Ligand binder design. Structure first.
Ligand SMILES: Nc1ncnc2c1ncn2[C@@H]1O[C@H](COP(=O)(O)OP(=O)(O)NP(=O)(O)O)[C@@H](O)[C@H]1O
Ligand SMILES: [Mg+2]
Length: 299
């Protein structure tokens, strides 16, 4: 069983057009209490309903900071962003080289690394068992994993090598930029792909990890088990290992295969659904909000 599965939704900013910025199709009622949102007369209830006005910092301290504590205690954690293309999934997870953006725009990734490094260094006040931080960067393109940090980022990995990909040591949270830069210049991107940057925290006898998952939004237009294979697999997993058991379908997809060591008992899984405020994307927003409902239900 998974220690906890949380669902969060973040409304994308409304792009003004010729100075005019129309109202969002997404609504947050006075009783939302930071957990519910109304769309198309449908009110969805989640653990976190963030309006486009929320800042990176506020979204991080509420949604991720908690997980950092769990990671340092030794638990496996995973934060996954999914949703329609252009809704700020990449922006929110912080997949772009930090030194290239402004502080108030930094995403989860660098913010989490700052807290991890701060608390780990906080253990120097009482220098005890040595600790080491690592980072791995994996890309998924056409149901095939690619180690963007190795010397063969062009060669598709195997089911075994996946949980063995290269882990580069991090002495300072500032080493992040390097890792992200190298990975970007090694990725394949069909022309759309998923990314997984895992922050590893290891001791002489323990290995905990925090997976930052940045799913790509579908490419093109859709016709007027019908979405991301990975998404379906995670729910199928959570549900499976959530009553009986006995063979968890980690092999149903590369995503659940790569995150197999994290999608275990007492681990943590958090979804961050990104939706568009535009009306022309209603069909997409509802589909995205409904999956999250399924995910929640899977318990
Ligand atoms: N809250 C925000 N504040 C300021 N800019 C934002 C915000 N959210 C989204 N953007 C901008 O919107 C653009 C797209 O963000 P992005 O994360 O790449 O969408 P995306 O979901 O990753 N697209 P895709 O990879 O095809 O699914 C970038 O310029 C972001 O900086
Ligand atoms: Mg992206």
């Amino acid at each position: 069983k998974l220690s906890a599965v949380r669902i969060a939704v973040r409304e994308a900013p409304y792009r003004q057009f010729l100075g005019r910025r129309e109202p969002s199709v997404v609504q947050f009622p006075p009783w939302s209490d930071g957990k519910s949102l109304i769309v198309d007369q449908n009110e969805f209830h989640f653990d976190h309903a963030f309006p486009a006005t929320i800042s990176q910092d506020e979204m991080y301290q509420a949604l991720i900071l908690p997980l950092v504590d769990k990671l340092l205690e030794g638990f496996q954690c995973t934060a996954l962003a999914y949703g329609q293309t252009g809704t700020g999934k990449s922006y929110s997870m912080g997949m772009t080289p930090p030194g290239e953006i402004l502080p108030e725009h930094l995403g989860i990734l660098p913010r989490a690394l700052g807290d991890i490094f701060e608390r780990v260094t906080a253990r120097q006040e009482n220098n005890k068992d040595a600790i080491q931080v690592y980072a791995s960067f994996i890309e998924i393109y056409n149901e095939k994993p690619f180690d963007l940090l190795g010397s063969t980022p062009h060669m598709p990995m195997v089911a075994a090598r996946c949980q063995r990909c290269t882990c580069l040591p991090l002495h300072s949270q500032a080493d992040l930029h390097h890792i992200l830069e190298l990975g970007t210049r090694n990725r394949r991107v069909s022309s759309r792909s998923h990314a997984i940057v895992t922050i590893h925290v290891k001791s002489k006898t323990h290995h905990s990890r925090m997976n930052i998952v940045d799913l790509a939004g579908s490419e093109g237009v859709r016709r007027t088990v019908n979405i991301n294979l990975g998404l379906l697999s995670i729910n199928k997993v959570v549900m499976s290992m959530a009553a009986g058991h006995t063979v968890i379908p980690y092999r149903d997809s590369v995503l659940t295969t790569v995150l197999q060591a994290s999608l275990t008992a007492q681990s943590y899984l958090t979804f961050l659904a990104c939706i568009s405020p535009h009306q022309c994307d209603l069909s997409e927003t509802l589909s995205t909000l409904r999956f999250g409902t399924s995910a929640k239900a899977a318990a």
